[PDB]
Amino acid sequence: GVATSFSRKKARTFDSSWNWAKQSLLSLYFEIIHGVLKNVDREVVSEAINIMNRSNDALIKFMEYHISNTDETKGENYQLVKTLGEQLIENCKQVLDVDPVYKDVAKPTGPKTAIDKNGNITYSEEPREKVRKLSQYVQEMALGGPITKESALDKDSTKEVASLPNKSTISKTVSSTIPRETIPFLHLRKKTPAGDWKYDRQLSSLFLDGLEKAAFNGVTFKDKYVLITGAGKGSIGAEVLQGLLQGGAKVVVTTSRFSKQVTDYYQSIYAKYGAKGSTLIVVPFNQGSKQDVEALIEFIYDTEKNGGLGWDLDAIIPFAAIPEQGIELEHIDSKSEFAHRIMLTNILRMMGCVKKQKSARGIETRPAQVILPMSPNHGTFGGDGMYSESKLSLETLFNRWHSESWANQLTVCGAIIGWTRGTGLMSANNIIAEGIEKMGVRTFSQKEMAFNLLGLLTPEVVELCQKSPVMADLNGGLQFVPELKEFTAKLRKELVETSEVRKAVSIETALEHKVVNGNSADAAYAQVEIQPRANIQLDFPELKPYKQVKQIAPAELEGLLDLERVIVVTGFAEVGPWGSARTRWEMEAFGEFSLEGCVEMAWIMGFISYHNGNLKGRPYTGWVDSKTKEPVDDKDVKAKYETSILEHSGIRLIEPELFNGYNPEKKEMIQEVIVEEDLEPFEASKETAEQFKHQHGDKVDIFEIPETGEYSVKLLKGATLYIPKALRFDRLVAGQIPTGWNAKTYGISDDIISQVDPITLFVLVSVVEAFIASGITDPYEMYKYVHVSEVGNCSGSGMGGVSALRGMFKDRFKDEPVQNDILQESFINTMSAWVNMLLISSSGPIKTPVGACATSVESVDIGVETILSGKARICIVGGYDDFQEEGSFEFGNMKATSNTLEEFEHGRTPAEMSRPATTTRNGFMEAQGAGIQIIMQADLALKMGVPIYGIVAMAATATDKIGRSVPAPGKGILTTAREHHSSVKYASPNLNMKYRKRQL
């Protein structure tokens, strides 16, 4: 348990709320335009608060353009978005230069337990009567209840959005509303001369007034620095975290289970909730480890220069904990002793550490408020292990704050947290909540308990804490329900009793009906279900009716363009890490495969293979596991293969079976040694022995072995040998074609596969798949419309047949067998030659570009200029590159690729290693495959009735300036926006299309 988790290098920072505001706005804009969010919904408000909390000038210029260019005519939903959007701009402008705010705006829910007819227990959170707002919640809390004695939302949220900046002043505070002889449900306590902590009217008033203002105006945490532990997904810790970030806090959050899953949860919260000035650092951390605690606090306080944060905490919230269930005093062992360390001794060591760091720097006037989770229930349930001992021993910190030398560095605010409902039914004891509330006790949603604890961080109860320790009772009257163990136990009895009797009556009525109606009215009762099969579509573009097409473009355009000289993309395809353009789009856009996605990927990777024949005796027609030949239905494919598909697709560890046995953990190099002492003779043919002689001369002795005809080869003293050795290489990951991919499955033959470099197989499959996206199933159909001299290939590679180069520069050297024509296969122009030689048979142009990482755009550019010169009517266009051992190594010596070992230090996984535009980007991720487009004259596309996926308006290439760095990118493509502005008073009539059409 006590093992170290914490590394500084694993820490992820989230600080870019300036970007997530724009994405939050544009998300809500299209949500409302597609009718997903309505006016009535409470989401448009909770979202609005978050957009206002990130208000800056950039974000108003953004909202203005997006709301002042909606056509309110095109539908009701466009009027809705423009009404709401104008409101949201008015608010955002007021709140500009105002500190952002925690404001819970959730519908307050109470518990409901249902038992139906058949004895099923259902739990549902159920809108309360007379508590529809957060304001109303603080009134309910102040009035206590009978047991605490001592002698425009959801109709028109466009209107409620308007009333978010408008700060609400109240003539009378709710403190006066607190009836005498009644203890409120939320209240602070005061220590009496006897030593006990009693309800204090006065302190409690102050707290509840700050809590009333928070409900109306909201609370800021601008300039608050917070450490929080035990704040994982679906905890009070995590609803506190949302509120801190909501009010612009800077927060360190610690996880015990660091992973992509968790680091994505937290990215998702910052991007929804982090207001302007907020940051979130997520670090892995074991609160059970003394060494992790020392290390964490030293990372928070160290200078950015020494690799730290340079912060100084204003609050510690140490809510980390492990559960111990049915551990009675007989059974206290290792888990409980470890739990006690997490929940008590290492809490003391963490406040000890923040005292030593604050004192080191002589910080005497910026104390950190520690918020300790206390219990009111010390020992009163049992089976809790050492939980009660843990909780009760923190009450020593309310005394030691007076008695030691750390009160200027630290303040204690103990929160006695009460009954907080979890998710549903199983979570907490949700089924008996309703029953406990009937006693006059109040239970809380997690979002209400979050509210109560963010109360303790308001400026008023920060002010008390700094005078004297604050003990907050957020337990809603459970003090006063007597014998709570045996009460709670009676309530669970009564629900179970009722459920069991009801379920026993339900079983017998089924048996004593099954017997009267056999299997006649209990067997013909049951319907027939349709499991969907995969109907994979080509995704040709939807053609609208002509009357709808003439709206989009201006009327002057008819007869104005020369369609012989408009280039149009007519089909496209690819082979890469996610299979085809179809499957890459599903992964790119939705992050998950459809039924059609899964079947295409399973067919590609070779998991499934269609069968139409005899299959273990009977005749069969369908899919079949390619390994076992067992029948498979499309419905079973996700469950059988989706997991296998995702392990062996995409960016992942290099798979040596794919790269000719390349194992980056083990690279064969060779060292040149001189032989000190002569070797043992080995046999060799006459011709091989003469080859050793020709090389070594005096340093080798070759002799006929007179019986056989073979030769002895003594390598003598002073002879050179090469001895192998093995580097461990640090680039372990790559974007590899999905394991299984085989040119055979597409229909390419073994004769072609043996002859040709593997990059050429990616290309052939891309050119076919591209012609099918263009509805050209037989390429020769082109030659009904166009001369054999009018089809071009303007595709290319950065490096070309890079397995063929290994053949002629390494495999020959090692006298391995290599095809005589290996050199032809290495040329960057051979891929195109094979495409002509096997599919097209054109005599049209062939302009193969090399443009390193820009060959594909250069290819388009050449392809267009070849068409607009009237050399070609159609052109294949695109790019291809393979991944091999030699280029991987060389891109590593150039420090261009990400070092995979560094990435593992940072706790990154292969998926999250290509991260463009990101703070922490540290080089690229090598991948392999091909992309092809087919481009034509628009004229010829309309005549052929081929699909038209887009118009290639422009395609350019630029170099940069004088340099001495070949991999350095430049600004030279700026020249596509070159225009003169000396004389920009009056509009050029050459831009007006009406004018241009008049002249025609």
């Binding site: 905890s235 009070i236 904990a321 492990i322 559960p323 229930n377 709570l484 005796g617």
Partner: peptide, 30 residues
């Protein structure tokens, strides 16, 4: 057909309070 019939007869710790929320009195087992 006899060959086909032959072959047919052969076959037929978590310290983050994500699971239990131990900060809360009732999550343990109240």
């Amino acid at each position: 057909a006899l060959e086909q019939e032959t072959v047919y007869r052969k076959t037929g710790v978590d310290m983050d309070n994500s699971n239990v929320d131990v900060v809360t009195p009732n999550s343990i087992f109240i």
